[PDB]
Every structure is written in C-alpha cells, then in structure tokens.
C-alpha cells in the first residue's frame, strides 16, 4: 500500500499517531506474501525507530505494530536478522514478554524465536540477555490447556529454537532450565505443540551421550515411543529422529528405548510409504544391531529380521545402504545362532544383488558382512555350504569381479574372500 518513502516521512514526523499509522503501513508491506521489501525497509534506516517504538508502553498499538514489523524483518536472511539484533532489539523484545497485552507478548515470543533460530551465536545471545526466565514464566500455569492455543504453539516453537543448533550446542544450564517445561509440552494434546516439542527433544539428543542422558533421565522415552506411533507424519518424523539419536548413545540408553516398546512399531516404520521415515527407521535399526547380543535377540524376537531383509531387497538406495550397515553390525556382534537365523531369513540373495552398486562404501560394508557370516560358518563347519549359496545366486561372479576394483579395501577383502572360501 504505502511507499517506503511515505513510511519514512510518517516515522520521522515526531507525531506519535502519525508514527503509529506509518508503522502499521510498514507492517502490512512486510506481511504481504509476494517478496516483502525487507532490504528497502532496512536501507531506509527504519529498524532503530521500530526498536524505540517497542518501548512505548503508553501506546501499546505501536509496540505491537513495531514488534510485528521487526518479527518479519528477522524472518529473512542472516544479514536481515543481524540488522534487527544490531538495532538493539533483543533486550527490548525480552522486556515485552511481560506486557499485559497477550498479543504483544506473543509477538515478542515470535520475534525472539526468529532471532534465536538464526544460529548458535544469536541463540546464545538471546540466552545471555535473559530470555529463558520470562519465557518459562508464561507457561507456569497448572494446566497448559488454559492457555490460548496459538499462544502456546508460538512459545513451544520459540523454545525449540533455543534448543536448536550445534557448534556449540546450547549451554548445559539453559537446557536443564528448559527441560521440565519441554517435558510438559511433549505431553500436551495439540498436534502442533507435540511436533515442535519432539523437534526440540531431537535437537537436545543430537549430541554426546551426556546430552542424551540429560533428556533420558527426565523419563521422556515412553512418550517418545507413543508419539512414534502417531498417525500424523509431522509428529512421527521428529519422534523417530529423537529415538534414532538416543540409540547412538550407550547400550543402556538404547535399552530404555527397547524397554519402552519401540521395536513393536518398526514393522510399520520399516515399510512406511514415506522414504525418509524408512531411511531413518533403518538407520535407527543399524544402531540397535550395533548393541549387545541380548539387544540383537530382541530385534530377532520382535520379528524384525525379515523386515531388514525386505528393505535390503527393495527400498530407496539410501535406505538400502542403511540396511547393509544394519546387517554388518548384526553379523559383527551377533552369536553364531543369530547369524544362522539371519541366513535362514534370506539375507544372502539381496546382499549379493547389492554388490552391483556403484557406491564404494556399500560394497565394503557388504563384503565385511559376508566375512562375518563366513566366520560364523567356520565355527560351525558349513563354510562350503555357504559358498554354494553365494554361488547359486550369482554372488561368486561379483566378489570375483571386485578384486580388480579401484578401491584398496575392496580389492583386498574380495580377494581374501575368494582365496579362503572359493578355492581347491
């Protein structure tokens, strides 16, 4: 509607009502779907004026309009977000969290979410300015259901950004301060609150075992497993990420996931029509089969080996690569009986067919698993029985062709295989 030129004229008028009308006009310009003129507004020098309007407690309308305008500037590129921070906006927005007007405090929540979402530095800067205490105070009600639903979703999303990003991860004391509120939100019945809570938990568990432990010790794994079975893709996706993260930790952290019943949802996850769900579920499997023999046994007992055979047989190639890793981890740590069971489920033929892949890493992984299965066969005396199985499905052709392959590890291992199990 208005031109930037006219907005500037109104803002510079030193007439509060004229300034309000011009700030609202800026807000509407910045709120249009078609390429908002953010850089034009910044170049006109308006950010410092918007920031000063955030402090006009006597004129809450101009606080709201300035907050909205600045929110949308901070929603753009890093350099645009930086312009808002450089104008002094962080402490001004934190001051607005205590506004008696819900729509104004909500806009400050939103703006701080955008600023913290830029990256690690601005996230930690929002924290150093003291955003966490007043953010959490807005949620200190006995039942979250009494809060307005849009208000609650905005607070959850902003808290999730305070949990987001690495190098560095969020300060340990900030995480520990936020976590109990996060756990409340993870048990709330709104699907958008649930999704962003799950995302927050997935960020917190994307790191070293000490960070996983701080989440797992709050008892959220059962709720994560429940959400793993949700019908809403926007909930299953972060729930699976968080579960996947947790099983990259210690065998005891992985056991909590198994204890909570996660493996029973993997028949559905490993056949999920959404390829990134299948991929992440198979990746998660590969870190469970890297565990203890008793954890491999629970994978067996839940009937999941046929599902791994399936994904190896037919899936998106990235998923098939995760399955190859799941099998190599299984054969690396499993008992002889567990490895025998894997052959009886049909692993050999799909394993052999993937030796035709161009990818050099997957060849080594598959060759490594064939090795581990042969070592199981040696312990039993059936090395030749296995060599005919690999022969019958056209496998021997592939290991044979592979000793003349560019890779050192591929040529060495494939030749070692030919020499030890396919000779006179």
């Amino acid at each position: 509607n208005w031109s930037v030129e006219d907005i500037v004229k109104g803002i510079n008028s030193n007439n509060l009502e004229s300034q309000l009308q011009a700030t609202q006009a800026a807000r509407k310009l910045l709120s249009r779907e078609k390429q908002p003129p953010i850089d034009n507004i910044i170049r006109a020098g308006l950010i410092p004026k918007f920031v000063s309007f955030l402090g006009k407690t006597d004129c809450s309308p101009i606080q709201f309009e300035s907050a909205w305008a600045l929110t949308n500037i901070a929603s753009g590129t890093s350099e645009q977000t930086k312009a808002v921070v450089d104008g002094g906006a962080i402490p001004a927005f934190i001051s607005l969290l205590a506004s008696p007007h819900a729509h104004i405090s909500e806009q400050a929540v939103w703006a701080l979410g955008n600023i913290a979402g830029d990256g690690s530095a601005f996230r930690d800067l929002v924290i150093k300015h003291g955003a966490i205490d007043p953010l959490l105070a807005l949620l200190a009600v006995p039942d979250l259901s009494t809060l307005a639903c849009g208000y609650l979703r905005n607070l959850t999303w902003t808290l999730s950004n305070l949990c987001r990003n690495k190098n560095p991860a969020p300060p340990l004391d900030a995480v520990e301060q936020i976590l109990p509120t996060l756990v409340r939100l993870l048990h709330h019945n709104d699907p958008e609150v649930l999704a962003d809570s799950c995302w927050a938990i997935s960020y917190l568990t994307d790191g070293p075992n000490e960070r996983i432990e701080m989440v797992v010790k709050k008892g959220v794994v059962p709720q994560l497993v429940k959400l793993l079975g949700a019908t809403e893709l926007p909930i299953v996706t972060p729930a699976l990420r968080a579960i996947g993260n947790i099983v990259t930790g210690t065998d005891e952290q992985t056991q909590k996931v198994i204890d909570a019943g996660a493996l029973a949802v993997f028949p559905s996850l490993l056949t999920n029509p959404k390829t990134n769900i299948q991929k992440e579920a198979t990746w998660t499997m590969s870190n469970i089969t890297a565990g203890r023999q008793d954890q491999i046994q629970q994978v067996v007992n839940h009937g999941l080996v046929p599902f791994l055979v399936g994904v190896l047989s037919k899936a998106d190639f990235k998923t098939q690569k995760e399955a190859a890793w799941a099998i190599t981890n299984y054969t690396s740590g499993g008992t002889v009986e567990q490895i025998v069971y894997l052959v009886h489920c049909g692993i050999i033929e799909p394993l052999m067919n993937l030796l035709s892949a161009k990818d050099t890493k997957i060849i080594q992984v598959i060759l490594d698993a064939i090795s581990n299965i042969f070592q199981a066969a040696e312990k039993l005396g059936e090395t030749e029985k296995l060599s005919i199985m690999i022969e019958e499905c056209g496998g021997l052709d592939k290991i044979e062709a592979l000793q003349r392959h560019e890779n050192e590890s591929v040529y060495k291992a494939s030749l070692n295989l030919i020499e030890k199990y396919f000779s006179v």
Partner: peptide
C-alpha cells in the same frame, strides 16, 4: 529439520 524462521503473513 523444520524451518528455523517464520514470517507472520496474517
């Protein structure tokens, strides 16, 4: 991961 930034188009 989801979008770190949200514009209010309202």
């Amino acid at each position: 991961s989801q979008s770190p930034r949200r514009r209010r188009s309202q």
